């Protein structure tokens, strides 16, 4: 049994929040991966890289392991986590955890018409990390993912079906590339379109409707 320590966490444990769309709606900082695990039960991780790094720690040459892990729904919820640890499997597990924490949604949209489900993205987007820039362009239906297999796998863990990609910079260093692609798919909920010009009233948080609950006793 998991006990929370945060009042977001004991809201999530109380069954008072159903989806993460409240948390995504209210820009909340998450600090409990159990929230992500209880709200994304069909969240499927995948390791991207495990690599031994040789440390020099207080006259000791040792071997730790850098694990770059991506978690991701088959719908539009992605997460990236990079972790160095003394063991392989501990680095795997804590990289999974860090990817559970940094889950962001995506806005996958249409190309051209308005039929069925959104398959491609909704606009062009761009992410940068290091010198790696990744540019995402919408694609017609059934065109696959034109991307390098790391980036392609990070997009397959998003439910992005159709996208053209172009990069620039030294894309050899794959963690800069995955971070830049992660920024590019995070910025899709960041570009204001005319179909979202409609003024909306500000809804209240769960922090005050459920303020009498979930307080530290």
């Amino acid at each position: 049994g998991w006990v929370p320590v945060t009042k977001l966490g004991r809201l999530v444990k109380a069954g008072k929040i159903t989806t993460i769309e409240e948390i995504f709606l209210h820009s909340l900082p998450v600090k409990e991966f159990q929230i992500i695990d209880t709200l994304l039960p069909g969240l499927q991780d995948e390791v991207m890289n495990i690599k031994p790094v040789q440390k020099q720690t207080r006259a000791g040459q040792r071997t730790r392991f850098k694990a770059v892990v991506v978690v991701g729904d088959s719908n539009g919820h992605v997460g990236l986590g990079i972790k160095t640890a003394k063991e392989v499997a501990g680095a795997i597990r804590a990289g999974i955890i860090i990817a559970k924490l940094s889950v962001i949604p995506i806005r996958r949209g249409y190309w051209g018409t308005n039929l069925g489900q959104p398959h491609s993205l909704a606009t062009k987007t761009t992410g940068k990390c290091g010198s790696v820039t990744v540019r995402l362009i919408p694609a017609p239906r059934g065109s696959g993912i034109v991307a390098s297999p790391a980036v392609k796998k990070l997009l397959q863990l998003a439910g992005v079906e159709d996208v053209y990609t172009q990069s620039n910079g030294k894309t050899r260093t794959l963690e800069n590339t995955l971070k830049a692609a992660f920024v590019a798919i995070g910025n899709t909920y960041g570009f204001l379109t005319p179909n979202l010009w409609a003024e909306q009233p500000l809804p209240v948080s769960p922090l005050d409707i459920y303020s009498d609950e979930a307080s530290a006793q």
Binding site: Q56, G60, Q61
Partner: protein
Amino acid sequence: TDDFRVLQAVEQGSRSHEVVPTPLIHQISGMRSQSGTNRAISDLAKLSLISKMRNVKYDGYRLTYNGIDYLALKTMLNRDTVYSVGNTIGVGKESDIYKVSDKNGNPRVMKIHRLQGANWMHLSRLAANKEYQFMSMLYSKGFKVPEPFDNSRHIVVMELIEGYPMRRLRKHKNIPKLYSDL
């Protein structure tokens, strides 16, 4: 010739830096493959001619007193000296004295000097050179003294002399001339 020449090369691969790593003994030798260098260093270490200092992220090779004198023997192969080694007469403080023999068969005296990494070797070298020059000064002035053959960098090889100390000498017949002499 060749193995002694490469051992002279790693002897000359000592007067470059401090405690010498593995790839410098790989490359100063300039030999063909991993075979000759690594199996030579292992033959050194198993005969205690070299030692391993592993200071963090840094392999290095520590020469003890053992794997030097061969080169001196090679240095004395150059200068017509000793072929057979070993008969202990006298273990002194700053030298160990042995009775040896040449290819010619005459017995000689081998004073090895042990006075690490550079300074034991180098101070034995300075001691041997200083004593060789003092012997040269005594023989140049004309003092009756043993004749030096060579000073193989830190091991002095000289002649043997048929003498016995005066504590076991009762007297001679010409005592006042011996007093005038002394």
